[PDB]
Amino acid sequence: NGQIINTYQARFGTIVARNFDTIRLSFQLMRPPNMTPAVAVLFPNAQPFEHHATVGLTLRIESAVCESVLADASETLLANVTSVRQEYAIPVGPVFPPGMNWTDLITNYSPSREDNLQRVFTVASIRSMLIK
Amino acid sequence: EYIENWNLQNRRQRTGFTFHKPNIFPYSASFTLNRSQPAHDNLMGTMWLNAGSEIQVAGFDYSCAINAPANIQQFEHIVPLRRVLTTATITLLPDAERFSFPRVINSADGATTWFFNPVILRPNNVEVEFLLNGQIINTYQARFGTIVARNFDTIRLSFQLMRPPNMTPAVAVLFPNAQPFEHHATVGLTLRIESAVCESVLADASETLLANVTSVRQEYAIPVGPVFPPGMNWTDLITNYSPSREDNLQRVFTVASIRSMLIK
Amino acid sequence: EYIENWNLQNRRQRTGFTFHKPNIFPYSASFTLNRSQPAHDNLMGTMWLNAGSEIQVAGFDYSCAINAPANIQQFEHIVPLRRVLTTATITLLPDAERFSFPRVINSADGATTWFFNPVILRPNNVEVEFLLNGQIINTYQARFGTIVARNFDTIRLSFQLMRPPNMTPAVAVLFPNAQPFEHHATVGLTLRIESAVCESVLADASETLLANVTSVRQEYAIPVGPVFPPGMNWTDLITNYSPSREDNLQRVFTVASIRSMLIK
Amino acid sequence: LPITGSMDTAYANSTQEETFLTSTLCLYYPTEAATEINDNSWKDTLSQLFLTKGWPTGSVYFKEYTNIASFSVDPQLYCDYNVVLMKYDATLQLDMSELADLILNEWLCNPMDITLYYYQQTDEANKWISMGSSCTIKVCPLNTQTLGIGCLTTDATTFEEVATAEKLVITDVVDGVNHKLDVTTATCTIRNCKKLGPRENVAVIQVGGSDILDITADPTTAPQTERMMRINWKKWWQVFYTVVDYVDQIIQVMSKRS
Amino acid sequence: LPITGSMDTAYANSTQEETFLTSTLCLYYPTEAATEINDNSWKDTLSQLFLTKGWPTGSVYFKEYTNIASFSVDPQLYCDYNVVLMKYDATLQLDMSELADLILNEWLCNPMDITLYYYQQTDEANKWISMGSSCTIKVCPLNTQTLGIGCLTTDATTFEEVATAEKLVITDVVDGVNHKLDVTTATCTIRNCKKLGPRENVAVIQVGGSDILDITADPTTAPQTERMMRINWKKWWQVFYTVVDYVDQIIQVMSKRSRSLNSAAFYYRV
Amino acid sequence: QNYGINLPITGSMDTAYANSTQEETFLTSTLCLYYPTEAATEINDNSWKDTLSQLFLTKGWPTGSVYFKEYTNIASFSVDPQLYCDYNVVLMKYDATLQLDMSELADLILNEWLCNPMDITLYYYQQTDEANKWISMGSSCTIKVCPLNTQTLGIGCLTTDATTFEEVATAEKLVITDVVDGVNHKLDVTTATCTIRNCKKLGPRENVAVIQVGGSDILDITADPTTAPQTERMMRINWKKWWQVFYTVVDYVDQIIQVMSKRSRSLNSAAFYY
Amino acid sequence: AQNYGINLPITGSMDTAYANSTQEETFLTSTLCLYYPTEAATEINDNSWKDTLSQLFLTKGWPTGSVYFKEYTNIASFSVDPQLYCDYNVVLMKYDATLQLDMSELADLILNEWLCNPMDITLYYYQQTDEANKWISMGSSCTIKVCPLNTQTLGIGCLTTDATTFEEVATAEKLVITDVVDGVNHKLDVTTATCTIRNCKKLGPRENVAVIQVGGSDILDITADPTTAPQTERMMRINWKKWWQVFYTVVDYVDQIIQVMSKRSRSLNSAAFYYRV
Ligand SMILES: CC(=O)N[C@@H]1[C@@H](O)[C@H](O)[C@@H](CO)O[C@H]1O
Ligand SMILES: CC(=O)N[C@@H]1[C@@H](O)[C@H](O)[C@@H](CO)O[C@H]1O
Ligand SMILES: CC(=O)N[C@@H]1[C@@H](O)[C@H](O)[C@@H](CO)O[C@H]1O
Ligand SMILES: [Ca+2]
Ligand SMILES: [Ca+2]
């Protein structure tokens, strides 16, 4: 809600984020003040830059507790729902995206779609208990 | 009403709080320049005031569509809501009154100021759409007065400025073909939600429950906790209206209704 | 209240519905030119906005009564109501805010447009009369703030524009004796019915019953019948408010109140 | 007769093309223009250039005048729209103000018999407009007893003249004071005209110079309306082409006679 | 002291009669008017015409000048409402603006010393007004070292000449720079003056010509104020009659003068 | 549009009026103005540029940022468009005979003109709207124009000879020819000394501040008679000596520069040749 | 169609479909100019070789009036005032061996956008702010003499009044691009009768022009910086025996020469209020 819950300044490896719904990455590119002759030929003062400075970060959520239903790399419930909806050639209804597109389902994740997704995932968990 | 909706939401059934002029809009007075330059003498875009239950929007063009195709400039203003309103009576009037007098306005970066001298045309081709999940629930084409919107969480106002093809000599001196525009064409709308039924708790002009909550929290000098904004800022509370904050707000409003029954 | 008034009108006794800002006025934004010409540079007459519970009227003269007798131009605006309001608290303010900024306005036939650059004088000699069957029930002479009107079905506003006999040099350049008037004298009033007791059913800013009726009629895609306007247009419903339409509206509002008791 | 109308009715389409197909405009150019023009068929040339811009072939007429003083005696202005190419001369400072006071304003008028009666201004609005070949107005005031204020009523030399040898005079003397005036009435006719308002069927294009036109009577207002225009004029052909090009804007700041 | 007036107060009656009957009015005309009028007692005739308009029997004063140059050597504006009638000359392009600058603005003025001290200008409000029979002003800037830039401190030929042979000069020069002066002291009298606000009992009536008068020496504004009118002439009788019968609209564009001075000059007060 | 031109900006109406940048405005930029030769003749100093440049150094500017450029008259200044530095102010002396030429100079300099050259001996030309004009510059060129019928015959002239053509410009440096927009035109321009081109008017060049030294306002910098808009950067003062004029400019440079903006500076000249 | 001087951040997706070929419309719309030395038109021996080439450009895709031909006498006289007009420019210049700074200064003007301020030598002492500030002088005969001052306005190795004690960085040259040390106020002795010198700032490269060096080795040092000698995409060189091979090569490879250049970034409407010409 715009309030800084957790902050991490120049700390890599595994971090923890206790409660959040927005991730703000603020990194900066600093020109190196001391450069060997192998580096000083890369960055001239003039216009032709054949080598472009680039600075990156990678942020991978390994595990998280969410109050709403989602999909992940552990369960197969979304796969069961899509397998049942694709096996029997089901027309596109009013709520779910055509073809059960998870990108279009989590892009516009409305509460009615949340309720439908939780109900159908619960029934998928029940059938995954019985049917292997 | 609050203990009825408490008992119905304790069993997960549908509820409705009836509000008279609900404070569903956070305070957002700003603008947008679709056409701009550092001279600020030929501008184009919208301005708006979202406050309480009232949207006042005004799209302006300095050229009065003298080079637009078919002398028509299309404006658009999309207001997303935070909670889904239901069965809302809405007074829709043309000619937004606040953006109709000359004013000087700071720029986007706050560096310089620019002047705004409006003359008011009527809004041609008003289309007010009430969107729920991107679907058009209600639409109104050039109809003013009291309108109704049965189920919506987005309000889309689509009005356009048309240059008048026949002008008397008192009007033709206002809008030249050249650059110096001392009179700027401006077209406005006003949309005021008089009463609405919302499933979540809000504040409005009828109840005093938010006033009781803030009076108790300010009388006893209470530290800022993890959920509510500092000083119980309703603009910051409805700007980021999370479901945990919704649950806290409903619980504290129910207790405020109980105390307002006992303590006058 | 609705089932009490149902049972009292089922025996033909007097009833009263208490409304907060009743929608007694149909949407009527128009004007009247008492003095006009195709040049549209010396005009005289009234403009008004009747919307919801609010009348905003403004009489303008371009000459500022420079040739009127005793430098006084009399304006008048008569609003007939559709149903007889009773015990109405009314906020009467001067200086109608909507008709106080420059605007361009289409003509009566819609052919050409004319420019309106107002400067605002205060309303001299305000007389607000509340007529019932042509008889003056209440009258108010130059009294603003909150007024009361006990029994009325016509509101007659009689304000006049008087040219100021003493003017500083900043004012004397605005109103010449000759023809080019770049600043036009304009005098306004605002009349807002805050609350009123009406024997017939209406809509207002407090209840949501009209919103429930329109939500049920729009949710299930209902064809237009013989009585109600298409789309439940309240402006067209209160413009021609026949007694059969009154009976249908009262019955459907009573059933809407019943369902609003059960369904939130 | 109150004329009412709604404020959300539709804008009608551009009836500029019908105004071009119906109306009849005529520009009034000086004679020294026609000296510098040097053509026998420039009238047909310009009228075909007007035909390009929507006016039909029998709608545009070309009338002359010698100078501002010769045009000041009886300008007729019989067309639907009128523009005059009022050429600036810096020596005549008030003559252009006289001519634009005449043509741009409506003058409801009455005649004046100088021998029989005595005359005065009823309000600010009326003036003594006198037209003719040579107008020599001589006004002497009278008090409430009809005695001469600073003159003798039987002596014409002690009269206090306000104009001499002028074609078009618009005389202003004091409002509430009675007067007796002397005119050489063989070459000049005077009459008292009130101005009702402006003429919307005439425009003035000041050829060169600066904004000089005090068409109002008092010193306190010198307003510049929409139909008092000004150009800069090296050659005439540039500004004939300017009028033919921007006729869609010049007719826009004017109105039909009826 | 703050005044707190209500908005719904009644408009008082027209007090132009109490303004006419309890105040004065001066008309200034050049002597070319006095030689084109050609009458001995036309002041009587004109004042009896003013008497119709409500002005009393002797409450309108007439005072002459020869030209704009000889009126600007000392404009002593006598009475409560002052109209000046100024004939346009194309060669007198700036000096007419000098006179209209001096008589339409309030100025705070003290005398200046040139041989002993030298002066600078604080802001755009103060200027250097100099009046007299001939004012040849030659000025040079200085610096913190008090040496002349582009000139010589001793040599008067190397100075920078802003005005010569002129009756009334209002020198504008840059602010925050020290300036050394060369004024003919035995003829010209110089003073620096801060422009407070507008002198407001004066109507300049440019009799002929075009509106040129740039009062504010800032080029970015050319304020055509309310009391700066322009009539065009053929005979003067037209101009005098126009001033007589539009006298209410010419007192209306003025107000009462509101400034307490200390010089205590002569006034033609009722 | 590779500078974010299709995208809209979003202001906020309640930003705290951050800082004042009049001194940064007056620091790295350049202000040069054009004065006539008669000015420096009456000035008759050899180093008045030093005097004025120190007085500009008083008013916030650094020293090496003010340049002085002469011109003979308004005719010999209009032989080419030359607008050198960041901030420009131009000082014209009024003359009643040079009436259109001042308006032509202000019409070129104040506005922006996107221009394409014209080939008069080969092709036929017309004007598309109000913005299209025919700007012709050179030492001396007489422009003789004749309109054409819709079947290519001369309206009131004869296209084979040049005598029956209608002249609009006789021996003048810089013409902005305005003809009627419908018909095509046959042209006689003496191209040995001239260069004619068509030019659209744009959003105007927001820097150049015309300072009219003497006279009254004359600058009709539009084409129609309807509008003569005296905009921000057409100022006028009166003169008796030039030293008063230059001291007025140096004093009120703080007021003059705040009426213009250096963001509308082009690269080299004032003709926007394609 | 707006927001002309703001520099807004765009946001483009990496899944947008590639647009169509656009090359035929570029050939139909824009214009091309080809600048050749007069020794070419001497060795060509034709009056109507312009029409022969223009019909070959018609084969390549351009219309008849879209390819303009202008010429120059030598590299020194082309370098007096290079004003390069149309939408796409490519210049052919022969390697004279004895002149090597002339071609590098020529391509330093032509292949770069120069924002230039005027100068007055009699009044001011001029220092260079940083590296992109150069002093570019052009005219009939430029002879530039520089005098370095100290921090007290006293010349270092040069008397401020004497002009023979000054030292020259160029004499009798048409165009001179002068680079001196940054931060030191300098006095100049340019012959201002036949030469105008201007205070220039290299904004970036010029996007509409290529330079084809007809004969002779790789010599082009654009950036007046000893460490970098950049070889950009538009410093092409070919070897010649006859000119007809050069003209048939530039006509055959229009689709490569127009490809390695672009439209000029300043000349667009989108660069409205960033130094548009
Ligand atoms: C709109 C109107 O007044 N009538 C016609 C209309 O029938 C036609 O469709 C329109 C085309 O733009 O042109 C108008 O003149
Ligand atoms: C006849 C009469 O009642 N006279 C009053 C007068 O007493 C009052 O002072 C004046 C204000 O202008 O208004 C008049 O109408
Ligand atoms: C009009 C256009 O540009 N689009 C075409 C597209 O329709 C076609 O399928 C494709 C084939 O490669 O080539 C594109 O240029
Ligand atoms: Ca007499
Ligand atoms: Ca009179």
Ligand SMILES: [Ca+2]
């Ligand atoms: Ca000197």
Ligand SMILES: [Ca+2]
């Ligand atoms: Ca000063």
Ligand SMILES: [Ca+2]
């Ligand atoms: Ca001819």
Ligand SMILES: [Ca+2]
């Ligand atoms: Ca044209």
Ligand SMILES: [Ca+2]
């Ligand atoms: Ca040396």
Ligand SMILES: [Ca+2]
């Ligand atoms: Ca360097």
Ligand SMILES: [Zn+2]
């Ligand atoms: Zn309420």
